[PDB]
Amino acid sequence: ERERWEKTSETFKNQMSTIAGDCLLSAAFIAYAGYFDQQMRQNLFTTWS
Amino acid sequence: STEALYQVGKEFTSKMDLEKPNYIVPDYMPVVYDKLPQPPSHREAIVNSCVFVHQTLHQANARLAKRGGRTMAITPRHYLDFINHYANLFHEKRSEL
Numbered sequence: 263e264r265e266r267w268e269k270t271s272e273t274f275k276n277q278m279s280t281i282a283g284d285c286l287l288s289a290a291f292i293a294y295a296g297y298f299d300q301q302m303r304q305n306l307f308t309t310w311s
Numbered sequence: 312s313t314e315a316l317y318q319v320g321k322e323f324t325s326k327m328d329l330e331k332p333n334y335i336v337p338d339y340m341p342v343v344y345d346k347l348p349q350p351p352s353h354r355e356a357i358v359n360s361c362v363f364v365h366q367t368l369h370q371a372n373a374r375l376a377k378r379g380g381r382t383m384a385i386t387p388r389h390y391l392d393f394i395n396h397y398a399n400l401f402h403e404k405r406s407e408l
Contacts, residue, residue: 274408281404282329286357289396290364297383302371309367310360 287311313362316390317344320358323394327401329354361397365390 277284290310295303336350343363348355368385375382 277408279331279333281408282353282357282401285400285404286360286364286397289393289400290361293389293393293396294364294368294385298371302375306367306371310364 313344313366314346316362316365316387317347317358319387319390320361320394321354323391323398324354324358327398329357329401361390361394364393 287307287310291303291307295306298306331353334353334356340349340351341359341363343359343366347359351359365385368389372382372385
């Protein structure tokens with residue numbers, strides 16, 4: 263199990279800076295993409311990315 | 312307006328810790344809010360991205376209406392819902408992590 267935990271620590275240090283953009287994209291998707299179909303949801307997500 | 316959306320995003324975002332000293336400003340820097348403070352920090356960039364997302368929904372309504380499909384209006388309530396979701400997801404994911 264420490265073979266996984268040790269690399270999980272460096273992944274923690276990696277997404278410590280990356281949480282903000284992922285949360286921004288997720289919040290935009292949840293708040294806005296509800297009405298549209300799959301293609302328009304993907305288009306909106308691609309534009310935001 | 313874009314300015315009003317910018318102040319709403321800044322005031323709602325300022326309550327959560329998001330400042331990072333190691334940010335690299337892009338040369339192009341696609342601006343949505345005019346008279347944005349140049350060079351911008353991380354908070355200015357994310358609020359610019361938020362108002363861009365709102366205006367992207369506003370433009371997608373027109374794109375769908377050109378085709379002729381059903382459209383629903385995006386509102387300041389939509390923007391506040393989005394910013395609330397951003398704050399909640401940010402706090403929850405940082406605490407869990």
